[model samples]
Target: TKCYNHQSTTPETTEICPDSGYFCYKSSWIDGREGRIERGCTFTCPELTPNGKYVYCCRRDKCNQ
Candidate 1:
């Protein structure tokens, strides 16, 4: 699958996920006083809720974008 991949300081880019990857995920967190975000591929979709930090996953290409 194809997913959006990037880190807090990096530009976003599309990537062909590995064989074990079947889902896309996006997450955000508060680090110190700054907020950070990330996106990538995963094998399973995690069940998460919004708190200080939160995450979500989906089963479609580029869904994390």
Candidate 2:
């Protein structure tokens, strides 16, 4: 699958995930008064948390956006 790949504070880019990766994820968290975001592909779905951070996973192409 294809997914959006980028670091905490960088421009977005596209990547063709390897066969082991099947899900695209988007995660965000508070950085003081600012918010930080990240996107990428993963082989497994992460457990949801109830903390200050947020995360989501999808199976569609470029769905992390």
Candidate 3:
């Protein structure tokens, strides 16, 4: 599928997360960073028209090929 953020990940990416499955930290951390990030930005784009008209959004990262 395609991603607006250019992540270009697969649908399976939804199964896991930035880190792990259920264990995904309620947030993510960057090396040498000084803050925690909330888990949930959403990658996989949901509805996309071939004509590129309007598109829908999904909170979960679930994209079908």
Question: TM-score, each model?
Answer: 0.73, 0.74, 0.18
Tens digit of lDDT per residue, candidate 2, span 40-65?
88987666554438788898998987
Model 3 pairs in collision: none
For candidate 3, give the lDDT: 0.31
Local distance difference test scores for all models: 0.77, 0.80, 0.31
Candidates ranked by lDDT, best first? 2, 1, 3
Top candidate (TM-score): 2
Error of 2 at 1 (Å): 0.1
Candidate 2 stretches with Cα past 4 Å from truth are 48-51
True lDDT of residue 1, candidate 2: 90
Residue pairs in clash, model 1: none
Model 2 whole-model lDDT (C-alpha atoms): 0.80
Q: Which ten residues in a row have the lowest lDDT in candidate 3?
A: 1-10
**Span of 10 residues, lowest total lDDT, candidate 1:** 44-53
- Span of ten consecutive residues with least summed lDDT in model 2: 45-54
